[PDB]
Design a binder for this molecule. Structure first.
Ligand SMILES: Nc1ncnc2c1ncn2[C@@H]1O[C@H](COP(=O)(O)OP(=O)(O)OP(=O)(O)O)[C@@H](O)[C@H]1O
Ligand SMILES: Nc1ncnc2c1ncn2[C@@H]1O[C@H](COP(=O)(O)OP(=O)(O)OP(=O)(O)O)[C@@H](O)[C@H]1O
Ligand SMILES: Nc1ncnc2c1ncn2[C@@H]1O[C@H](COP(=O)(O)OP(=O)(O)OP(=O)(O)O)[C@@H](O)[C@H]1O
Ligand SMILES: [Mg+2]
Ligand SMILES: [Mg+2]
Ligand SMILES: [Mg+2]
Lengths: 163, 163, 163
């Protein structure tokens, strides 16, 4: 799937397959009526927001998150743009990537993503969520149930085409 | 466009430009009312699901399609994770990529994608599908008709912005 | 965000953060009721349509934008496909990339994108657009207001999750 890095609300840890929603700029399990933005994913071929690499703040950024470049002038003026390092930056601090912190999740936003399902979910049918687990409903299109629902497990797994 | 690999229902071959839908976990031409998931595409800059590379099953995967890693222990315990090869795997078998099998299609899910249109389709207007060909309707936004509809050809081509 | 290159309608220049729509196959600021296709973006990790590289026309393309390949035959017939150069192509012309022309914009279509907001926009709430600036409404989900609305500036900045 195509995915993005998001932060869980309580700094929780939402296991893969649960449908997720936003509350105060963070992700949690999705209940009914609530809008499903995606599914926690381990299958993502393309994911945005993994500063992996350097602290997300190493360079300053404008109001729209874009790297602020200073314009440097030289030999009667060859001009080039170079990034504008943060005042708060610390090379004394040691950086841990987002794919190693626990508050950070890979959330799949588009494509075939495997989802936790209940007994209600059917092939060729849409879905809602309660407890973050899928249940027959209004959204996306269930591709195929891949590991069928059992009461002992509490869940099954279907591929849903999230768009 | 941003796209994904899908399998056609009868192991068919759906030519590029046709709008497509799902039936029992596979793709076919899209008729009316049916949900359009995408368009067969030759313009995809980013496509998921092309194992290209190795048999999709070389390594085992959990219930959510994610690579199962075994935890290996060493000199009083340096620990690292290594993939867990399939029992069914055969290095005696010779592997053909998905971009060479005929049941596998590049399906464009997001972005400007060229679509087969009829006489009804107009600029700045939405679309439906019948026969997999576009027809004036409710979905997406027709960017521009690029090769206008003729009865002799049976179709025209418009760029649609699929989202 | 995941983004695409688009051309502005009057060959304008739409600054980053404005919501945008289509009119006659081109982008302009989005007003009310109109469909929001995206937001001008400087944060795009993946963007399609930047020929960067060579004139978009160097090679010929079929009716669906896909590279036409000629089939070449050799020593009793090893066959390979090679691109089919345009009649109109000029190696006497010198090529300027799309990321340097002014009519070409990076439009973010999916993911967390920073957007210009008014006084009305709230956290956890949907949006519409007037003047291309966000205003409380029906679309997407406002993640967090990052630079709060002031009358003196005329706008604030919120992260919206465009899908
Ligand atoms: N001022 C700083 N200078 C350099 N590195 C920093 C700074 N603040 C935090 N870090 C790095 O970030 C990690 C822990 O802080 P944290 O990443 O939670 O801050 P953050 O700015 O909110 O980033 P994120 O949004 O990725 O959580 C450490 O790996 C540390 O190296
Ligand atoms: N058990 C196996 N071990 C190694 N390679 C295999 C195995 N089964 C199939 N293949 C490879 O897959 C190709 C044909 O089988 P096929 O790919 O249809 O199986 P599949 O597992 O359904 O994969 P896909 O979902 O890509 O079709 C051949 O290129 C062959 O090398
Ligand atoms: N016939 C041609 N042969 C080679 N290069 C060309 C040709 N026409 C335009 N260009 C290149 O394109 C740039 C200016 O023309 P322009 O790109 O607007 O044409 P275009 O085909 O509409 O491309 P785009 O859709 O990117 O605007 C120059 O950098 C020039 O090198
Ligand atoms: Mg943080
Ligand atoms: Mg198969
Ligand atoms: Mg042009």
């Amino acid at each position: 799937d195509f995915a993005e890095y998001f932060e869980s609300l309580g700094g929780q840890v939402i296991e893969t397959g649960y449908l997720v929603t936003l509350e105060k700029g963070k992700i949690r399990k999705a209940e009914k009526g609530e809008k499903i933005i995606g599914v926690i994913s381990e299958t993502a071929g393309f994911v945005l927001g993994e500063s992996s690499f350097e602290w997300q703040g190493a360079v300053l950024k404008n109001e729209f998150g874009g790297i602020i470049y200073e314009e440097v002038t030289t030999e009667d003026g060859v001009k080039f743009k170079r990034p504008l390092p943060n005042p708060d930056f610390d090379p004394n601090k040691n950086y841990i990537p987002r794919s190693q912190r626990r508050e950070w999740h890979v959330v799949g936003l588009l494509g075939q993503i495997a989802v936790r399902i209940d007994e209600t979910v059917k092939q060729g049918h849409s879905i809602d969520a309660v407890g973050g687990v899928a249940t027959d409903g209004d959204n996306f299109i269930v591709q195929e149930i891949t590991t069928p629902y059992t009461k002992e497990k509490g869940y099954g797994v279907a591929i849903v085409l999230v768009k």
